[PDB]
Structure formats: structure tokens, C-alpha cells
Amino acid sequence: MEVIELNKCTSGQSFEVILKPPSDPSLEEIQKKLEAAEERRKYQEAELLKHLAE
Amino acid sequence: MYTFVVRDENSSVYAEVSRLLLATGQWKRLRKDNPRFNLMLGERNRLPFGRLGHEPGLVQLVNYYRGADKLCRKASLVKLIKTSPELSESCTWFPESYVIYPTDEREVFLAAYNRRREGREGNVWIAGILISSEASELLDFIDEVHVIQKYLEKPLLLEPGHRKFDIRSWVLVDHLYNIYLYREGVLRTSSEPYNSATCHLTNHCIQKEYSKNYGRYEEGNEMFFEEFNQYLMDALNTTLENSILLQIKHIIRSCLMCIEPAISTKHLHYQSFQLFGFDFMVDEELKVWLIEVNGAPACAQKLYAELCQGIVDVAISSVFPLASIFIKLHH
Amino acid sequence: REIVHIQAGQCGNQIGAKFWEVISDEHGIDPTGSYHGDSDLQLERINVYYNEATGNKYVPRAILVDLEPGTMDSVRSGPFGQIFRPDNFVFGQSGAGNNWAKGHYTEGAELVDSVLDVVRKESESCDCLQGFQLTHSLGGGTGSGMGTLLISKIREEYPDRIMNTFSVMPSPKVSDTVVEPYNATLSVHQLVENTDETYCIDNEALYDICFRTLKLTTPTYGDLNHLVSATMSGVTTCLRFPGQLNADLRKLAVNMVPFPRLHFFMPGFAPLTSRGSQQYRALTVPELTQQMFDSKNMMAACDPRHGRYLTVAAIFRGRMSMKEVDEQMLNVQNKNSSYFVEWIPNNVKTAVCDIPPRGLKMSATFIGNSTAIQELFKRISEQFTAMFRRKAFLHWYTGEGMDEMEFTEAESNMNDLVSEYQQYQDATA
Amino acid sequence: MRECISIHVGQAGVQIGNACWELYCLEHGIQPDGQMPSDKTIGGGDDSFNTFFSETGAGKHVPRAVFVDLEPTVIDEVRTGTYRQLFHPEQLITGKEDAANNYARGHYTIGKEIIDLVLDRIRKLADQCTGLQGFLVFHSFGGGTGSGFTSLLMERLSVDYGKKSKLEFSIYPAPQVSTAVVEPYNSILTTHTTLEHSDCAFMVDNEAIYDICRRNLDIERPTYTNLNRLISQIVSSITASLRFDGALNVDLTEFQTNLVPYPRIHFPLATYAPVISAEKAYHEQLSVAEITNACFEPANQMVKCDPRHGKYMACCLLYRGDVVPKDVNAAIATIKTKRSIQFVDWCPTGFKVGINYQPPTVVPGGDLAKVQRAVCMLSNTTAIAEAWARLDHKFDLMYAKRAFVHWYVGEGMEEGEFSEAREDMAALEKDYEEVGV
């Protein structure tokens, strides 16, 4: 039960107590996936409008 | 109405409990995966404790204490007893024991062995089991986790028969951590005269498959407390309560109070109860030794109805009221 | 977030007119379009259904459609008839003769562009159009045939908006003509494809509520429409007043529709009380909650105990213990959890609104997506086949250019829908 | 001095942000008009409170904050709230139609149209920082904007601010207040996409806050207002070290080094005490020992779970009020002898302790009573994985039938993203399992 690194200031203090020792995706990759999804939306909508055209 | 789920179909004890619950007309059995239950009769392995107590408007209760495995596993019990100051290495009611891994305190066991044998003070240890006097054959048999502990060479022998036995006690711990000892125990007896050099293991299954005298002294190699008490009086001029039960109650309380901080559900968002099976041995000086604690025990056929009803009264209905066979071990 | 309301044909315009009378009263709008309310909650989301004209008048965002003028002349002379925008009355003269083909392919086709012109004008004045609500019957010609023609044309022009219908399903017990199963079968397939949410209202159920529960020995269409308009007010409460759950058409669909074709809801209302000294008795939350789940308070003539709830939305109106509402709602699910599919967790959502409907201190409205709705489509299919196997009454449709194959295909489509519901009434988790 | 930028996404993020910045102003003596009579350096400074507040020449202290929502009605009440004068229009971003409780709508369909605007508004704030250290991000798991747009923003922030730290305050869904059946889907989808982009995330389960409000504040049916004032207290306890003089957790990097030894296991459990009803005239003031002991009661945790059946990797005690180190050590000693506290073998069994002498500030008129001392414990325990198990189980139930999946595929999301995200959560649960037993 040891107290370590005691720092004291006007606003308070801090310290450590030890009881026992121990025993990425690039910008173009993101926009690739965003545009791929948007193209899937456009395809599904184109199919619907084609269905309604029939 | 109250709802419950059954998740261990192989549990004879809770098969009878669920049948009593339904027979009250105030309980309904849901599908085993329905989360809107009051009571869960859980599975033995990997019970999903983390999904309990998150159902708005449902008080939830489960028939197992998370963390009670520490007490109900061979190796775990040894570690718990030797490392818990409440129980101490200097624990008088638990046989000397060590944990050994195959392929660990295997060194410490050999040290106590060398001291025992060179003094010639009796050196028989127990380990799919086998008892041996040479450690060579013991450590050899394991590598094909395990525990080796001192084999009580001077057990109390019933007469007639010169018979070895063990005492099973059933203990119910409710959601308030009240400890209830079922008034009825049972002695699983050996039908074979105790040979000092199958008659050493009192398992009901072993005594039925490998034993020649299975069921000649008492029905099913099971002697209940009334007959045993009468024996101790006639043979040893004492009672079951004085010579044995005080120690059993002491041991039960010590074990369960030791782990209470780790498993209590007092301020938890779900509640637990559990039925335990404590196994004891008695030596010729009427000293009681704890052998193991079973977390999923069965019951004696003659006692199923009584104990299971007791479980509904004490563990289930106390939480879910509807519209004593136990001895309460106080703290 | 504006909604555009369309009412089509005789049934659609008579129920639609009553709906606007009911919700106009709830929001404080008189037949003049002038607000005379006492609470700011009345105006908070008023623009969902009303446009604001000069002088702070409020005009329903409603388009009235029919192929004959009779019913809409009645609406214009009715109680709140002067509140509707005159240019939003779009009607022909020929009628549709209770004939889906006339509504969908011939008479309706000649009028539909005029309707779409008014729809486009209303939609253009929306800074965030939610979508459309259509009121109509499926058993007639205009609401059923031209109503579903309209839905298809609206989807083509507004494909990313929600389409919601209140659809009155025919029943032989409350019937005008023998061809209603034909018109309804043709329409259901349109709804399966082109709506996001359809409230299934069975005239059989409405009649039985009036007769068995309300003790009206001779129900009229007017009495039936009282129940429908009060139910429509209930199920749209979350769209029209401040709230958290199902506050717009798309969040509602996302909560209620786990599979795209299974979007046909059973609505319910409580309390339903006989007129007399019993009508002044106070309801408790438990009684209100039990009555809202009672089959007799449902309006699709389907027994919910014959299926399972995929999703449920419940709306309570009035001053009441919101804590006690939560309690009783949980009690219903925990007590009869077998009737809620277990593979959609927490599938029952509850909203509370402090403003009670007119004539009641407390009410509850029920929206259930239940597999038991398959009974409604089974009934229609059986009635369809009884006639179609003899090609009875088909000349009314082939005379408008339809072929028998289109009927065969509508029959197969509804049998598919029924079997799709059956897939999930047995699916376990 | 190094600045921190707070970003509030969706309704839950925005309303919690409003609660926090209200509390900050009370704690720092900043009035609703932005003026700070105690700040004697007009129009500038590098004090601790300048980490969260910039300064105008007129002496207004402006939060370094951006609010983003895909519908305007939540952020419109910031524009007209008490502290409307604190924020300028550039800080408040609103769209037209929201994500309809649909991760795909927030991430792909609607997010793609607003992300560049949001980043431009964050860039404006970043340009005012002499040494920006990173971002604090507030959002729900359950909403379509809180889930879907947050993961998109977090991806872009890793690209545009590669070296900066990112912390999360995440609202975990509870059916007692939840608004959508699909919230388990959105939770798993956003956790999967955000995991590699967040350095430390503080999950708050609405279930726990709701029950704390019911039990300790005796509120029979808590509202978001009640919930957010309690959450703002916890958040304030966590950020106090960035905003006041001190030596513990003085920058975002220290949160990671002190609480997160393994990058993927970056979800510390917060526990807070005491929570006392203000409608009580007199309440016995709790000692250091009693509030510290209360840090090990599941009833006081931000996520209901059992730390006894897991292992700790780190533990930080953050005290506010009349607390001296001697009493903390005497409380810890006692608690260590009574409770089940087990650290992983390769971590030291110990506590990093911070004390701020100023007691917690409470909102005038709120539900929380003023206390002489309070504590927030941040413990990285494997027990919090119970929350993942719950969420993953509900996910599995619905996804086995593809319930509601068409809503997501209809926005351009591929079904494979569901199972990819679920396998990631399975690996996460396996990780906690490995550390915890």
C-alpha cells in the first residue's frame, strides 16, 4: 500500500496507490464504398421505375 | 401469473420442481428461449448470467449462483481453501491436498510425502480414480488437471459389515444468503467389508456395478439419518447431532460464508439461489472431513418429493408468493 | 414535415370527411379554418396536415377524388365542407360502376392526370414532404381501382416518399355488390407492392362492434364511419402532436414493418362503450389496456390469438399515470408472451398523448402487425375463387379490356401473400 | 494548453451536449451571455478552461463545439435556449429529414450529403487551436444519425486528423426509453465501424441512468431531462481534469495510457456516487469511505454488470469536493479487504487518484442535491462485455430471420455488412473472455 507521484496544486491533488505489483482506411477507400452504396440505390430505383414503366 | 423456463432437461431435482410449480396453477412454463420469465432453471454450463435482470417489470430469479464453481470444482476448492484466510492452510476439517497438472504444486506434495513416509506415519493418497502408496504411480497416472489428497486410512466403519461410507448433505442457499441444511441426509455405504490391503469408493454407481453385496444391509446402499443415529447410540453411545452434525454445520457455514462476498446477489439486478451437495467422511475418532461440494446434486429417491417441495417454499415462493424441513445455519 | 392526404370514391370521401372533422376539432380549427383553441399543443405540429393561408386560416392538405360528383357534393355541403380548398375537389361524371377495371384502366385513367396535378401542387408547397395518406375502400371501383392507379403514379413521381393507406376491406355481411371480392383481390396486390403501411379496416368488424358492443340494432354506414374516423385520429396522434415514438411516417414504418410485403395492420380502439349511463363511468388504465388488446375492439375481423404479433404500436390519450401505463403494457406482454414473436425483441412500443379525443377522458389506440391478418386475405381469396371458378360476373371486366389471366395472377398473388404470413406464424427462435 | 473540440451528433448527442455545456458554464462562472467575470485576460488566454472555451475580443467565452443533426428541431432549441448567446450559427448544423432510426440512412444516404459541410465547420474550429489534441464525440448507439453518421464522421476524422485522439460518450439502448426496434442493429453496425477509430469510449446504458433516477432521485418516470442532467454530471467528472488545474488525465492521450492497455478493449465502466434527491431537506453527508465503497456497487454503475466476475485492467478514482489523500487510502484499504477486486496478472493492482477540491456543481432547480464530496470511478473491467453479449443476442434473434434488413439494403447497404459487423463483435466478446478468465 504505497503512494506514488503525489502532485499538489491550489485546485486539488493527484497520486497513485499500488496494492500489489503485476505477476486506417484512406479517403479514396471511404468514397469508394460510399459511391458503391449510392450506385446500389440508383440501380434499385432504376429497376423500380422500369417495373412501373411495364 | 408467474413464468419460468427450463434449461437443464437432465436435472432430476428441478424436473420435480417444475412439475410442482405447474401443479400450483400459478406458474406457466415458457419456451426455453423466451426472455420474459420470472424464474430460470438454468443449464449447468455457460448459464448466461449477463442477460439476467434486464427485463423491465420482471423480477428475475435463477437457480444457480454465478461464481459458486470456485467451491464445486476439485482443483478450485483446494485453491480456495488454501488461499482464503477465512479457511487457512491450517484448516482442520479438510484433508491435505495439492493441485497437479499433467504433461501447480507438484513439488510441494513430494516434500510433504518424503516427510510422511520416512516417519512411517501412513502414506496413502488418492487421485476414473486410483489410490496408491507410491507417488510414482500417482504422478504417472495423471499425465495420460487433477488433485492428490491424503486418503483417510482410518475411516469409521459400520457394523455389522466393517463397511465404509460417506455422508451427503443437501444445502439450499436462498436469495438473501440464508443457508438451509436439509434435515434429511443420506449415507452412501459400501456393501463390501473395508479392506486395508471397490470397497474403498462409496459411489452409488460403483457400488451397483462392481459390488457383490449391493443392498443387503440397507436398501440401495443408502442408510438414512434415523438408522445411522440409532447405530451411533447403540454402538458408540453418542448421537448423530453431537458426534457429526455440529461439525457438518460448521463446515457448511465456513465454506459458504467464505465466498459470500464474491457471489451474493444482495444488491444485484437479478437474484440467485442454489442447491448444493456436500460430501463428508467420518474417521474412527468421529472427526468429520469435507470431501467435496457438488453444485448440481441429485437427491435420494425417498427424499425427492420432500426436498423439492422445500425448494419451492424457501427459494421460489419467498420471491414469488402464491395466493420446516430445513435447519437454518445462522451468521 | 407535411403529409398529403388523398380520399377517393364514395367510402374514401365519407370516411375522409369525418376524419378531417374529428382532427380539426382536436386542433381547434372550426369549419371556417380559424383556430379557436386554448392549448399551444394544438398548433405545434398543425402543419403536418394543414396549410396556412392568409389571415392565419388553416387549410387541410387534402385532395378529394371521385369519378361521380354525388358524394363530394355532400362533403362540400357537409359540416366541415367549406374548409377544403375548392381546387382540391377533382371529380368526373361517369362513375365507376363498382368496377375495378373502370377505376384502374378506363374511367379512372381519363381523370388521374388531373389528380396528379393537384398532388404536385400540394407537394411543391412542402419544405419536407413525408409522404401520402390515402383513404378508400377496396370493394368498389373508384377508391379501389383508381385509388391503386393513383398510388402507382404517385410512387413513380415520388419514389422516396412513404405511402400509407386506410383501406376498407369488403365483407359479404356489409356488402353493396357481389363483385367486391374481385375488386379487393385486384387491389390488395397493388397495395402489397406500392404502400409502406396499410391499415386494414373490415366492415364486418365495424358492423359487429356497432351491433354487439355499442348495442346499435341497425348500424348505418354513418355509424361505421364514426369508429373509423376515431380510429384514424388515434393512429395518427403520434404524427400530429409532440412525441418521441413513431413521430413520422418513415420511423413508424421502420418500427412496424420487418418484411416489406407484410405491412397490413390491424387497428383497434378502446373504450367502446354502449350509450347510456354506462358511458360516464371512469376507465382505469388496466381496463383501458385490457380492452385495447381485446379482439372485440379490433377492426379487421381477425382473431389475434390465431397468429402472432410481429410488432405492436400502442397510443394512450388523456391524463393518466404514465407509470401505470408502462406497468400494464409490460403486464400484457409478460402475461401473454406466447402471442408476440420472440425473434423481434421489445417489439411493442407505447406512446402517450395528454390531449384526449372528443367525448372521452381517456382512450387507447392499437396498431398491430399480426400474422392473423392472413385470415382476412384467406376470406377474400375464398370468395374470389367461388365466383372465378365459374368466371361469374367477369364480363363486367373483360368489357373494359381486362383478360382472365390478370385475375388468375391476382389470385396467385394473394395466395402467395397468405403463405408468406404462414411462414412467420410458425417460425421460432 | 491544448484545445479539445466537442462534437454532438443526433438528438441524444445534442441534448446531452446542451446539459454538459450548461454545467460547464456553471462550473467556470460563465454566464449565459458568454461573459466570465473571473477571467481577467480579455479576449485571450491559455488557461485550463480555454481547452473547451475560446474567447472573443468582447470577452465572450465560446464553446469549442459543433452540433450536427439530420433534422432541425433538436438543434433549433439550442438556437433559442438559455445559452443561445454562447454559440454562433457556424456551430449548429441541421438537415431536413433524419435517418429514420436507420444506420444505413445516416451513414450512406444522408451522411454522404452533409459530411463535407460538417468537416468544414470542424475545420473552422480546428484553425483556432494552437495545439488541438482531439475530439470528444457524443452520440447514441440507437438512432440512425447517432449511429450511422457518427461512424462516417469518425472515419473522416482519422483521415483529416490522423494524430489526434478521439473519445466517445455513447448512449447504449434501453427499451424503457428506446424509440426503435432496430436499435441493436444500429448499435452493432456503428460499433464495428467506429472501433478502430476511437481511442476510449464511455458507454452509458440508459437502463442504468433510468433506474438510478427512479431509485435515488425518486422520479417515477424519468424524462430525458432528468437523464441528461445526471449524465452531464458524470461527463463533467470525466472531463474536469482537462478543464481545471491538475496532474491526472490532463490531456486526451492520458485517458488512453491510464485506462486502455489494449486498443480494442477501450470501454471503461463509469461508476458515480453519491446521487441524492434534492427534494430531501437533510441527507446525512457521506464520508470518503462510503462514496468510495459505493463505487463497487452495480447499482451505481453507468452499465449494469458484475465486476466481481471479470478482471480489472486499470482503475481511476476522480473525487470532487472535500477529500484528502489520507482518507482515500484508508477507504481503499478497507474496501480491498471486503470486496472481490481482481486485476489481470500483468497489471498492477492499484488506483490512480485525482482530487478536485471544488464540490460538484448542480443545476439550480434540478433533481440532484448539492453534496460535500462526490466521486467518479473509471475502471476498465472485462465485466462490461456483458453489455455486448446482451446486444449481440438481440442482433442474432432478428438477423436470423432478416427482420428489418430490407430497410438497410434499400439504402445501398449490403447484407454482408451485417455479418461482418457481427463477426467483429464476436471477436470482441472473445477478447474480453480471454482477458477476463
Ligand SMILES: Nc1nc2c(ncn2[C@@H]2O[C@H](COP(=O)(O)OP(=O)(O)OP(=O)(O)O)[C@@H](O)[C@H]2O)c(=O)[nH]1
Ligand atoms: N440519455 C439520453 N438518451 C437519448 C436522448 N435522446 C435520445 N436518446 C436515446 O437515443 C436513442 C435514439 O437515438 P436518437 O439520438 O434520438 O436518434 P438520432 O441520432 O437523432 O438519429 P435519427 O433521429 O434516426 O436521425 C434511443 O435509445 C433513445 O432512448 C437523450 O436526450 N438522452
Ligand SMILES: Nc1ncnc2c1ncn2[C@@H]1O[C@H](COP(=O)(O)OP(=O)(O)CP(=O)(O)O)[C@@H](O)[C@H]1O
Ligand atoms: N481422502 C479420501 N479418503 C477416503 N475416501 C475418499 C477420499 N476421497 C474420496 N474418497 C471416496 O471417493 C468417493 C468419491 O470420490 P469423490 O467424492 O472425490 O468424487 P465423486 O464425484 O465420486 C463424489 P459425488 O458422487 O457426490 O459427485 C467418495 O464416496 C469417497 O468415499
Ligand SMILES: *[C@]12O[C@@]3(C)CC[C@H](OC(=O)[C@@H]1[C@H]1[C@@H]4[C@H]5[C@H](O)[C@@H](C)[C@H](O)[C@@H]5C=C(C)[C@@H]4C[C@H]13)[C@H]2C
Ligand atoms: C364515438 O364512438 C362511441 C362508441 C364512443 C367513443 C367516442 O365518443 C363518442 O362520443 C362517440 C359515440 C357516438 C354517439 C354520440 O355520442 C351520439 C351523438 C350518437 O349516439 C353517436 C353514435 C355512435 C354510434 C357513437 C357511439 C359512441 C367516439 C369514437
Ligand SMILES: Nc1nc2c(ncn2[C@@H]2O[C@H](COP(=O)(O)OP(=O)(O)O)[C@@H](O)[C@H]2O)c(=O)[nH]1
Ligand atoms: N365503412 C364504410 N364502408 C363503405 C362506405 N361506403 C361504401 N362502403 C363500402 O365500400 C365498398 C363499396 O365501394 P365504394 O367506396 O362505395 O365504391 P367507389 O365509389 O367506386 O370507390 C363496399 O365494400 C361498401 O361496403 C362508408 O361510408 N363507410
Ligand SMILES: [Ca+2]
Ligand atoms: Ca482569458
Ligand SMILES: [Mg+2]
Ligand atoms: Mg463430484
Ligand SMILES: [Mg+2]
Ligand atoms: Mg358505393
Ligand SMILES: [Mg+2]
Ligand atoms: Mg433524430
